[PDB]
Amino acid sequence: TIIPYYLSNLLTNPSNPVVFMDINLGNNFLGKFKFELFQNIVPKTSENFRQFCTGEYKVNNLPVGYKNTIFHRVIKEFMIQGGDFINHNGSGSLSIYGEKFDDENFDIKHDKEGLLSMANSGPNTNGCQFFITTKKCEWLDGKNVVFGRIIDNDSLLLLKKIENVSVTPYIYKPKIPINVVECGEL
């Protein structure tokens, strides 16, 4: 059919929210992540993520979000994670429900690549850090909550590019910083 696909035609659930993050390798553009948040099934956490993308929050009545953040952990063949606007090293934690919150559920499976999941430190530790599966990691079904997914093949290529960035041997931190310059909602 000769026709531009609308934002909905790319989602699994047309009524679902869509955000994005602009990625720059060090200082140069790399691509744009287009994530579909699962508000339908995971409305509690789903909102927590969207909130940080657009900048709907305050820390001492100030603006808080995923902007100017980075991906502090890139593990090839496994996943990339970041979104620690608090410390920027993988320590900070916060949410639109305090500084942590319960695991809404584990209905969604880490069956494929490109899934957004909540990086926690034990059960019910969902904070502001998220990770994007780069390969299916079933064994996480029950430990982490899948609350989103990339929607197009361009977000998939960017994910692969990042996954390959050279990192520091044991900590897995990218040598040439991978930062989220801009982000919001589509």
Domain 1-186: CATH superfamily is: Cyclophilin-like (2.40.100.10)
> Which tokens go with 36?
């579909």
CB atoms within 10 A of CB 73: 20
Domain parsing of the chain, residue ranges: 1-186
- State how far the Cα of 133 lies from the Cα of 106, in Å rounded to an integer: 15
Question: 3-class DSSP state for residue 49?
Answer: helix
Nearest CA-CA partner of 15 in 50, 39, 46, 47: 39
End-to-end CA distance of the chain: 24
75 — phi, psi (to 5°)? Answer: -110, 100
Which resolution, in Å, applies to this structure?
Answer: 2.8
